[PDB]
Amino acid sequence: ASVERVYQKKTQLEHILLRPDTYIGSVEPLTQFMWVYDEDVGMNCREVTFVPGLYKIFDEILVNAADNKQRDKNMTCIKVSIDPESNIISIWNNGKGIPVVEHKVEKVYVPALIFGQLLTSSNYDDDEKKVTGGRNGYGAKLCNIFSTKFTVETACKEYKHSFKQTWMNNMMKTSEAKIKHFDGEDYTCITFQPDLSKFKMEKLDKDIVALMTRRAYDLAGSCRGVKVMFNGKKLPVNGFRSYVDLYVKDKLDETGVALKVIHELANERWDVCLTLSEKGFQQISFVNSIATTKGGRHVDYVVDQVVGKLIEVVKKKNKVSVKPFQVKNHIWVFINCLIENPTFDSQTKENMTLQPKSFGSKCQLSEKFFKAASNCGIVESILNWVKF
Amino acid sequence: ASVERVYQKKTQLEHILLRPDTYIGSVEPLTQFMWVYDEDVGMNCREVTFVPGLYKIFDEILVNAADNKQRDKNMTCIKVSIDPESNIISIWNNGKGIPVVEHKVEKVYVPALIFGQLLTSSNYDDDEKKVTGGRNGYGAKLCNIFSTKFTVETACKEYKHSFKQTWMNNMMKTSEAKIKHFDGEDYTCITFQPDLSKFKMEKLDKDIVALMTRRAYDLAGSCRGVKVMFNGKKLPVNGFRSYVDLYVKDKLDETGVALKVIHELANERWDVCLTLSEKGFQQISFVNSIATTKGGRHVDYVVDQVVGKLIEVVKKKNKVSVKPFQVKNHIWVFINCLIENPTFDSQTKENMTLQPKSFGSKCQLSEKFFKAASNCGIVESILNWVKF
Ligand SMILES: Nc1ncnc2c1ncn2[C@@H]1O[C@H](COP(=O)(O)OP(=O)(O)NP(=O)(O)O)[C@@H](O)[C@H]1O
Ligand SMILES: Nc1ncnc2c1ncn2[C@@H]1O[C@H](COP(=O)(O)OP(=O)(O)NP(=O)(O)O)[C@@H](O)[C@H]1O
Ligand SMILES: CCCc1cc(=O)oc2c(C(=O)N3CCCc4ccccc43)c(OC)cc(OC)c12
Ligand SMILES: CCCc1cc(=O)oc2c(C(=O)N3CCCc4ccccc43)c(OC)cc(OC)c12
Ligand SMILES: [Mg+2]
Ligand SMILES: [Mg+2]
């Protein structure tokens, strides 16, 4: 093989399609136990088979909608629609639209720039301490690139215009945006047909729909001051506590006793629930409405506090050595937090790596919370084991 | 703020410096328990404070050296040198050098292309099933970008020339390469001065040196047929088993009994050691000489087999319910494997996401191995707990 065939240069766009895993995660099927929202049983834990990259291009658009609550605190509503037969997904939000005007540096309409060109963002100035999930300027373009059809509609009353542009064929084709006069209430609606051939799928099947549906419930629980609709029906979730209830309200421990769930809203930026786990350490956590499915420093930050205080309680009774990992093994923690300018080791944002001193806020759990944590059955499970 | 200040486009190079976490990991200090190789005690587990991105730019160059064993099976040696006082790190390997000739498409010398331009690689053709660690065409440029001085020396007898080019100031400055006549044994030497200001460090301190040193021992253990030298001394590690010995050969369980370590080289591509853990699940694993420090499907693939067989043994004696996570909680597994065209969710390659059916090989552990695994004290720990 010649030098020119062995050593190759790729464009950014080529690289995304060649190496999708670092941008959206695996484009191959994955089977694992997790929580989804099914049509027949609602929230439940089961084996699910899905393609991570498909989940993630949906998630990018969903989190972008959530992020608009930080641009416009008056935003009230996100609407999610999924139609497997037509293969059409739409995510709509109110609050301020996107400026329908030509960017004077880039010489294109602002929505065309930030949905149709890589590395474009309103989150590149870190002197502003934002609790948006958006950080890198890729998400929306990644969804576009993995869609056969990708449509952006937005209306910005400030500029008195609406904007509609459609891309097709993995962001490789587009056409002149339709601009009109607009004097109503702002909105943005992203409508896309995912390119199922990129994920070796024939249709949006029940498992991927159940996962996408659960993310809508996640958002109802995590995104304060925003109501969520799914396929035309408002979700009956109002606050993180009611969201946590979907997991633990009807649940018993192995001895037949209802799980005791304890909650502290430490401040506006930190909501924490804790209960007993009997299947090893479990965490459900959100940073700026991103599901941090590998955890991160925010999880460790909260859990370490609990583990420390519970070792004190067990030590007042362990009259041998109780190790942190044994305590952590009995914890099921739920965390909803807002972190200033978070960092992650991947675009998929499963693991939040920002150190706590940089969070912009603290979550020091009260002594009342710790007293309750010492009574939710975690201490008893440990003390029962101190005998063996 | 105006449209042009709010909505910004970045170049690829700008984005790497603005958002380093997705390319090299956190540029902030991290403190955690882990294994390093210290000057006074050798291999040990302790709290270590280091900057992940600094570790990773070193690792990129080290794995690139390991990868050359796949270009030239005759390669025998990698030499690592770290001088904290001068701030100079050098990684040298023999076997075939890099072609010292002008790339006819890109119109630059091949080494200048693949060390000085983003998205350049010999690993972009996946029709070839390679067990290199290199996949994305970033690594070497990332080290260059986070170095104040970055030098590439290579000699390719086939082309009868040597090549030397130096970059400076985060890959923003360079000068004409020095080409000479060469008729000796090929080599590549990468020498760099990391830009410690990017990591808020004054010097290569003991902790980062101990971690970098351990990676050299990792490579001696993981990279078959390649001897490793560190600061002028060959490392006394010959094969994965002798490497594993550095962790467990002198170790006792909590009852004062030496850890029983069991080993199977299933085939050329899979080497597996297993022993008892008393601090929850532990894994040390390598894919194509990358330290997979978050694990991946290769870890689950091996562990699931063990967990399945051990539940059978415990069930022949558990005359209640022993759950997989409880068995996994007593396992310390060591894995060295070669995976065809692996995937990862990040450039840092901590988590290998390729599904096992795509590995290019299998690791079905023998019945002899499983019999031994049922006697290394994992079953006894479980059975002891079945009483409580
Ligand atoms: N629903 C929306 N309403 C208003 N602005 C939006 C909306 N969706 C996207 N945007 C804007 O479009 C930009 C590009 O989105 P995106 O490509 O996801 O980048 P990002 O969110 O800034 N960072 P990331 O998601 O980490 O890659 C964002 O920075 C926002 O300014
Ligand atoms: N020591 C070396 N000997 C020979 N070729 C090398 C060496 N180091 C780097 N290269 C070549 O330089 C190219 C660029 O290296 P790099 O930028 O690390 O990309 P990569 O290894 O292919 N992929 P990645 O490490 O996943 O970003 C490699 O693909 C190799 O062809
Ligand atoms: C590649 C996508 C992985 C993934 C995606 C997802 O959406 O959820 C997950 C959950 C999961 O169901 N949830 C429930 C609410 C959201 C959440 C937040 C943090 C942790 C877990 C969860 C999960 O629970 C074992 C495990 C998961 O992967 C290991 C995933
Ligand atoms: C951001 C870099 C993280 C990291 C880097 C590293 O180099 O090592 C690690 C080890 C670690 O020391 N080793 C020993 C041989 C290499 C290896 C392979 C897989 C798993 C662990 C290990 C570790 O052991 C708890 C934990 C680690 O991070 C959570 C890291
Ligand atoms: Mg985004
Ligand atoms: Mg490389």
PDB file of all heavy atoms in Angstrom, chain A residues 31 33 40-41 82 90 98 100 110 124 156 163 174 183 196 226 234 244 255 259 269 286 306 352 362:
ATOM      1  N   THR A  31     -27.357  -4.131  25.137  1.00  0.00           N
ATOM      2  CA  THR A  31     -28.377  -4.723  25.999  1.00  0.00           C
ATOM      3  C   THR A  31     -27.962  -4.588  27.457  1.00  0.00           C
ATOM      4  O   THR A  31     -26.892  -5.068  27.847  1.00  0.00           O
ATOM      5  CB  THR A  31     -28.607  -6.205  25.674  1.00  0.00           C
ATOM      6  OG1 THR A  31     -29.062  -6.335  24.330  1.00  0.00           O
ATOM      7  CG2 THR A  31     -29.645  -6.793  26.616  1.00  0.00           C
ATOM      8  N   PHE A  33     -29.655  -3.803  31.786  1.00  0.00           N
ATOM      9  CA  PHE A  33     -30.722  -3.474  32.720  1.00  0.00           C
ATOM     10  C   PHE A  33     -30.705  -1.980  32.992  1.00  0.00           C
ATOM     11  O   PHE A  33     -29.644  -1.397  33.231  1.00  0.00           O
ATOM     12  CB  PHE A  33     -30.558  -4.247  34.025  1.00  0.00           C
ATOM     13  CG  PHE A  33     -31.246  -5.578  34.027  1.00  0.00           C
ATOM     14  CD1 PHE A  33     -30.563  -6.724  33.665  1.00  0.00           C
ATOM     15  CD2 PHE A  33     -32.578  -5.680  34.388  1.00  0.00           C
ATOM     16  CE1 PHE A  33     -31.197  -7.957  33.668  1.00  0.00           C
ATOM     17  CE2 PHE A  33     -33.219  -6.902  34.389  1.00  0.00           C
ATOM     18  CZ  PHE A  33     -32.529  -8.046  34.029  1.00  0.00           C
ATOM     19  N   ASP A  40     -47.083  -0.114  28.852  1.00  0.00           N
ATOM     20  CA  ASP A  40     -47.944  -0.972  29.666  1.00  0.00           C
ATOM     21  C   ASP A  40     -47.706  -0.838  31.174  1.00  0.00           C
ATOM     22  O   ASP A  40     -48.666  -0.916  31.946  1.00  0.00           O
ATOM     23  CB  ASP A  40     -47.822  -2.453  29.234  1.00  0.00           C
ATOM     24  CG  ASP A  40     -46.387  -3.009  29.255  1.00  0.00           C
ATOM     25  OD1 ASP A  40     -45.424  -2.280  29.569  1.00  0.00           O
ATOM     26  OD2 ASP A  40     -46.233  -4.213  28.947  1.00  0.00           O
ATOM     27  N   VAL A  41     -46.471  -0.633  31.633  1.00  0.00           N
ATOM     28  CA  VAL A  41     -46.178  -0.643  33.065  1.00  0.00           C
ATOM     29  C   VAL A  41     -45.615   0.673  33.575  1.00  0.00           C
ATOM     30  O   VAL A  41     -45.328   0.785  34.774  1.00  0.00           O
ATOM     31  CB  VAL A  41     -45.219  -1.798  33.433  1.00  0.00           C
ATOM     32  CG1 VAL A  41     -45.872  -3.145  33.163  1.00  0.00           C
ATOM     33  CG2 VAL A  41     -43.907  -1.684  32.661  1.00  0.00           C
ATOM     34  N   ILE A  82     -43.098  11.701  19.379  1.00  0.00           N
ATOM     35  CA  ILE A  82     -42.400  10.601  18.722  1.00  0.00           C
ATOM     36  C   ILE A  82     -43.443   9.785  17.971  1.00  0.00           C
ATOM     37  O   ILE A  82     -44.412   9.307  18.575  1.00  0.00           O
ATOM     38  CB  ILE A  82     -41.629   9.722  19.722  1.00  0.00           C
ATOM     39  CG1 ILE A  82     -40.597  10.563  20.482  1.00  0.00           C
ATOM     40  CG2 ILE A  82     -40.930   8.570  19.007  1.00  0.00           C
ATOM     41  CD1 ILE A  82     -39.794   9.775  21.506  1.00  0.00           C
ATOM     42  N   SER A  90     -40.187  15.334  17.169  1.00  0.00           N
ATOM     43  CA  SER A  90     -40.201  16.788  17.278  1.00  0.00           C
ATOM     44  C   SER A  90     -40.075  17.182  18.741  1.00  0.00           C
ATOM     45  O   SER A  90     -40.664  16.546  19.620  1.00  0.00           O
ATOM     46  CB  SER A  90     -41.472  17.398  16.674  1.00  0.00           C
ATOM     47  OG  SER A  90     -42.599  17.168  17.488  1.00  0.00           O
ATOM     48  N   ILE A  98     -34.705  31.943  18.650  1.00  0.00           N
ATOM     49  CA  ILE A  98     -33.341  32.258  18.227  1.00  0.00           C
ATOM     50  C   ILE A  98     -33.376  33.472  17.307  1.00  0.00           C
ATOM     51  O   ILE A  98     -34.224  33.526  16.405  1.00  0.00           O
ATOM     52  CB  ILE A  98     -32.691  31.056  17.526  1.00  0.00           C
ATOM     53  CG1 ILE A  98     -32.647  29.864  18.478  1.00  0.00           C
ATOM     54  CG2 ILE A  98     -31.292  31.414  17.053  1.00  0.00           C
ATOM     55  CD1 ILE A  98     -32.350  28.573  17.790  1.00  0.00           C
ATOM     56  N   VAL A 100     -33.625  35.775  14.464  1.00  0.00           N
ATOM     57  CA  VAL A 100     -33.767  35.559  13.017  1.00  0.00           C
ATOM     58  C   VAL A 100     -33.151  36.784  12.354  1.00  0.00           C
ATOM     59  O   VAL A 100     -33.816  37.756  11.995  1.00  0.00           O
ATOM     60  CB  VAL A 100     -35.222  35.317  12.606  1.00  0.00           C
ATOM     61  CG1 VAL A 100     -35.311  35.117  11.100  1.00  0.00           C
ATOM     62  CG2 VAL A 100     -35.773  34.106  13.369  1.00  0.00           C
ATOM     63  N   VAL A 110     -28.429  33.337  11.837  1.00  0.00           N
ATOM     64  CA  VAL A 110     -27.965  32.755  13.098  1.00  0.00           C
ATOM     65  C   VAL A 110     -28.417  31.304  13.248  1.00  0.00           C
ATOM     66  O   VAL A 110     -27.585  30.457  13.600  1.00  0.00           O
ATOM     67  CB  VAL A 110     -28.398  33.640  14.280  1.00  0.00           C
ATOM     68  CG1 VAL A 110     -28.128  32.929  15.599  1.00  0.00           C
ATOM     69  CG2 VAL A 110     -27.667  34.994  14.241  1.00  0.00           C
ATOM     70  N   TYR A 124     -19.555  29.313  24.707  1.00  0.00           N
ATOM     71  CA  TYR A 124     -18.107  29.325  24.614  1.00  0.00           C
ATOM     72  C   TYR A 124     -17.446  30.374  25.502  1.00  0.00           C
ATOM     73  O   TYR A 124     -16.219  30.380  25.597  1.00  0.00           O
ATOM     74  CB  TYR A 124     -17.689  29.554  23.155  1.00  0.00           C
ATOM     75  CG  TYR A 124     -17.799  28.332  22.257  1.00  0.00           C
ATOM     76  CD1 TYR A 124     -17.981  28.473  20.891  1.00  0.00           C
ATOM     77  CD2 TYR A 124     -17.698  27.048  22.769  1.00  0.00           C
ATOM     78  CE1 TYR A 124     -18.070  27.369  20.060  1.00  0.00           C
ATOM     79  CE2 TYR A 124     -17.781  25.935  21.941  1.00  0.00           C
ATOM     80  CZ  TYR A 124     -17.966  26.107  20.584  1.00  0.00           C
ATOM     81  OH  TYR A 124     -18.056  25.016  19.744  1.00  0.00           O
ATOM     82  N   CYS A 156     -38.704  34.725  16.665  1.00  0.00           N
ATOM     83  CA  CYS A 156     -38.153  35.680  17.624  1.00  0.00           C
ATOM     84  C   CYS A 156     -38.887  37.001  17.411  1.00  0.00           C
ATOM     85  O   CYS A 156     -38.590  37.742  16.467  1.00  0.00           O
ATOM     86  CB  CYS A 156     -36.645  35.836  17.452  1.00  0.00           C
ATOM     87  SG  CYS A 156     -35.816  36.614  18.870  1.00  0.00           S
ATOM     88  N   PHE A 163     -38.431  31.703  11.160  1.00  0.00           N
ATOM     89  CA  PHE A 163     -37.368  31.084  10.386  1.00  0.00           C
ATOM     90  C   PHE A 163     -37.673  29.603  10.270  1.00  0.00           C
ATOM     91  O   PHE A 163     -38.059  28.966  11.252  1.00  0.00           O
ATOM     92  CB  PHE A 163     -36.022  31.320  11.071  1.00  0.00           C
ATOM     93  CG  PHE A 163     -34.891  30.562  10.468  1.00  0.00           C
ATOM     94  CD1 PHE A 163     -34.018  31.182   9.603  1.00  0.00           C
ATOM     95  CD2 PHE A 163     -34.680  29.233  10.788  1.00  0.00           C
ATOM     96  CE1 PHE A 163     -32.969  30.495   9.051  1.00  0.00           C
ATOM     97  CE2 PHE A 163     -33.630  28.537  10.239  1.00  0.00           C
ATOM     98  CZ  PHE A 163     -32.770  29.172   9.371  1.00  0.00           C
ATOM     99  N   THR A 174     -29.292  21.170   1.817  1.00  0.00           N
ATOM    100  CA  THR A 174     -30.235  22.104   2.415  1.00  0.00           C
ATOM    101  C   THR A 174     -30.758  23.022   1.313  1.00  0.00           C
ATOM    102  O   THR A 174     -30.459  22.837   0.130  1.00  0.00           O
ATOM    103  CB  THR A 174     -29.593  22.899   3.561  1.00  0.00           C
ATOM    104  OG1 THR A 174     -30.615  23.578   4.309  1.00  0.00           O
ATOM    105  CG2 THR A 174     -28.591  23.916   3.016  1.00  0.00           C
ATOM    106  N   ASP A 183     -45.210  38.065  14.821  1.00  0.00           N
ATOM    107  CA  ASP A 183     -45.504  38.986  15.912  1.00  0.00           C
ATOM    108  C   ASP A 183     -46.172  38.274  17.085  1.00  0.00           C
ATOM    109  O   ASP A 183     -46.823  38.931  17.907  1.00  0.00           O
ATOM    110  CB  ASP A 183     -46.396  40.131  15.415  1.00  0.00           C
ATOM    111  CG  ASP A 183     -46.291  41.372  16.281  1.00  0.00           C
ATOM    112  OD1 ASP A 183     -45.485  41.372  17.236  1.00  0.00           O
ATOM    113  OD2 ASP A 183     -47.015  42.351  16.002  1.00  0.00           O
ATOM    114  N   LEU A 196     -32.040   5.827  10.478  1.00  0.00           N
ATOM    115  CA  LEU A 196     -31.962   4.537  11.151  1.00  0.00           C
ATOM    116  C   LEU A 196     -30.924   3.613  10.525  1.00  0.00           C
ATOM    117  O   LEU A 196     -30.414   2.725  11.215  1.00  0.00           O
ATOM    118  CB  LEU A 196     -33.337   3.882  11.155  1.00  0.00           C
ATOM    119  CG  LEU A 196     -34.394   4.636  11.961  1.00  0.00           C
ATOM    120  CD1 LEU A 196     -35.661   3.795  12.112  1.00  0.00           C
ATOM    121  CD2 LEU A 196     -33.861   5.047  13.321  1.00  0.00           C
ATOM    122  N   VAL A 226     -40.464  24.136  34.323  1.00  0.00           N
ATOM    123  CA  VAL A 226     -40.796  23.762  32.955  1.00  0.00           C
ATOM    124  C   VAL A 226     -41.682  22.525  32.998  1.00  0.00           C
ATOM    125  O   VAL A 226     -41.289  21.491  33.557  1.00  0.00           O
ATOM    126  CB  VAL A 226     -39.537  23.500  32.110  1.00  0.00           C
ATOM    127  CG1 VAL A 226     -39.906  22.967  30.728  1.00  0.00           C
ATOM    128  CG2 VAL A 226     -38.702  24.776  31.993  1.00  0.00           C
ATOM    129  N   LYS A 234     -49.687  16.185  28.991  1.00  0.00           N
ATOM    130  CA  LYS A 234     -48.796  16.674  30.034  1.00  0.00           C
ATOM    131  C   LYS A 234     -48.385  15.531  30.952  1.00  0.00           C
ATOM    132  O   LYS A 234     -49.205  14.690  31.322  1.00  0.00           O
ATOM    133  CB  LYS A 234     -49.478  17.776  30.847  1.00  0.00           C
ATOM    134  CG  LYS A 234     -48.651  18.242  32.038  1.00  0.00           C
ATOM    135  CD  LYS A 234     -49.418  19.192  32.947  1.00  0.00           C
ATOM    136  CE  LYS A 234     -48.673  19.406  34.258  1.00  0.00           C
ATOM    137  NZ  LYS A 234     -49.416  20.313  35.176  1.00  0.00           N
ATOM    138  N   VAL A 244     -38.733  11.239  41.765  1.00  0.00           N
ATOM    139  CA  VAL A 244     -38.137  10.154  42.536  1.00  0.00           C
ATOM    140  C   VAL A 244     -39.206   9.156  42.953  1.00  0.00           C
ATOM    141  O   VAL A 244     -38.965   7.942  42.976  1.00  0.00           O
ATOM    142  CB  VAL A 244     -37.383  10.727  43.751  1.00  0.00           C
ATOM    143  CG1 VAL A 244     -36.948   9.621  44.686  1.00  0.00           C
ATOM    144  CG2 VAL A 244     -36.171  11.533  43.279  1.00  0.00           C
ATOM    145  N   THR A 255     -37.124  -7.393  53.206  1.00  0.00           N
ATOM    146  CA  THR A 255     -37.823  -7.863  54.392  1.00  0.00           C
ATOM    147  C   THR A 255     -39.310  -7.534  54.363  1.00  0.00           C
ATOM    148  O   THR A 255     -40.018  -7.836  55.330  1.00  0.00           O
ATOM    149  CB  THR A 255     -37.191  -7.266  55.654  1.00  0.00           C
ATOM    150  OG1 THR A 255     -37.342  -5.842  55.647  1.00  0.00           O
ATOM    151  CG2 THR A 255     -35.710  -7.614  55.728  1.00  0.00           C
ATOM    152  N   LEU A 259     -39.540   1.059  51.481  1.00  0.00           N
ATOM    153  CA  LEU A 259     -38.326   1.860  51.489  1.00  0.00           C
ATOM    154  C   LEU A 259     -38.595   3.203  52.153  1.00  0.00           C
ATOM    155  O   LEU A 259     -39.541   3.908  51.791  1.00  0.00           O
ATOM    156  CB  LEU A 259     -37.833   2.082  50.062  1.00  0.00           C
ATOM    157  CG  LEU A 259     -37.309   0.884  49.274  1.00  0.00           C
ATOM    158  CD1 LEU A 259     -36.842   1.356  47.911  1.00  0.00           C
ATOM    159  CD2 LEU A 259     -36.194   0.172  50.011  1.00  0.00           C
ATOM    160  N   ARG A 269     -29.976  24.838  44.009  1.00  0.00           N
ATOM    161  CA  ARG A 269     -29.162  24.142  43.027  1.00  0.00           C
ATOM    162  C   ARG A 269     -28.948  22.667  43.332  1.00  0.00           C
ATOM    163  O   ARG A 269     -28.329  21.977  42.514  1.00  0.00           O
ATOM    164  CB  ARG A 269     -27.803  24.832  42.895  1.00  0.00           C
ATOM    165  CG  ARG A 269     -27.915  26.298  42.539  1.00  0.00           C
ATOM    166  CD  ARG A 269     -26.594  26.866  42.060  1.00  0.00           C
ATOM    167  NE  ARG A 269     -26.660  28.317  41.909  1.00  0.00           N
ATOM    168  CZ  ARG A 269     -25.728  29.058  41.325  1.00  0.00           C
ATOM    169  NH1 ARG A 269     -24.658  28.515  40.772  1.00  0.00           N
ATOM    170  NH2 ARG A 269     -25.875  30.374  41.295  1.00  0.00           N
ATOM    171  N   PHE A 286     -28.615  13.950  37.769  1.00  0.00           N
ATOM    172  CA  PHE A 286     -28.731  14.893  36.669  1.00  0.00           C
ATOM    173  C   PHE A 286     -27.882  16.115  36.982  1.00  0.00           C
ATOM    174  O   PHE A 286     -27.872  16.613  38.118  1.00  0.00           O
ATOM    175  CB  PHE A 286     -30.199  15.299  36.438  1.00  0.00           C
ATOM    176  CG  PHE A 286     -31.106  14.125  36.233  1.00  0.00           C
ATOM    177  CD1 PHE A 286     -31.715  13.514  37.317  1.00  0.00           C
ATOM    178  CD2 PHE A 286     -31.319  13.607  34.970  1.00  0.00           C
ATOM    179  CE1 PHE A 286     -32.526  12.411  37.138  1.00  0.00           C
ATOM    180  CE2 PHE A 286     -32.131  12.511  34.786  1.00  0.00           C
ATOM    181  CZ  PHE A 286     -32.733  11.905  35.875  1.00  0.00           C
ATOM    182  N   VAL A 306     -22.536  11.356  53.034  1.00  0.00           N
ATOM    183  CA  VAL A 306     -23.396  10.359  53.659  1.00  0.00           C
ATOM    184  C   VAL A 306     -22.549   9.244  54.249  1.00  0.00           C
ATOM    185  O   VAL A 306     -22.688   8.890  55.426  1.00  0.00           O
ATOM    186  CB  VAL A 306     -24.414   9.819  52.636  1.00  0.00           C
ATOM    187  CG1 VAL A 306     -25.271   8.728  53.267  1.00  0.00           C
ATOM    188  CG2 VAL A 306     -25.272  10.962  52.096  1.00  0.00           C
ATOM    189  N   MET A 352     -19.466  13.436  34.887  1.00  0.00           N
ATOM    190  CA  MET A 352     -19.172  14.848  35.125  1.00  0.00           C
ATOM    191  C   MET A 352     -17.919  14.964  35.992  1.00  0.00           C
ATOM    192  O   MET A 352     -17.912  14.524  37.148  1.00  0.00           O
ATOM    193  CB  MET A 352     -20.379  15.528  35.770  1.00  0.00           C
ATOM    194  CG  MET A 352     -20.479  17.015  35.495  1.00  0.00           C
ATOM    195  SD  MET A 352     -19.386  17.978  36.510  1.00  0.00           S
ATOM    196  CE  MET A 352     -19.981  17.586  38.155  1.00  0.00           C
ATOM    197  N   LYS A 362     -22.441  24.831  46.994  1.00  0.00           N
ATOM    198  CA  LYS A 362     -22.182  23.729  47.900  1.00  0.00           C
ATOM    199  C   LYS A 362     -23.481  22.993  48.197  1.00  0.00           C
ATOM    200  O   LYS A 362     -24.580  23.532  48.042  1.00  0.00           O
ATOM    201  CB  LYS A 362     -21.561  24.208  49.219  1.00  0.00           C
ATOM    202  CG  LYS A 362     -20.170  24.806  49.086  1.00  0.00           C
ATOM    203  CD  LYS A 362     -19.580  25.137  50.456  1.00  0.00           C
ATOM    204  CE  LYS A 362     -18.130  25.600  50.350  1.00  0.00           C
ATOM    205  NZ  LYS A 362     -17.970  26.796  49.474  1.00  0.00           N
TER     206      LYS A 362
END
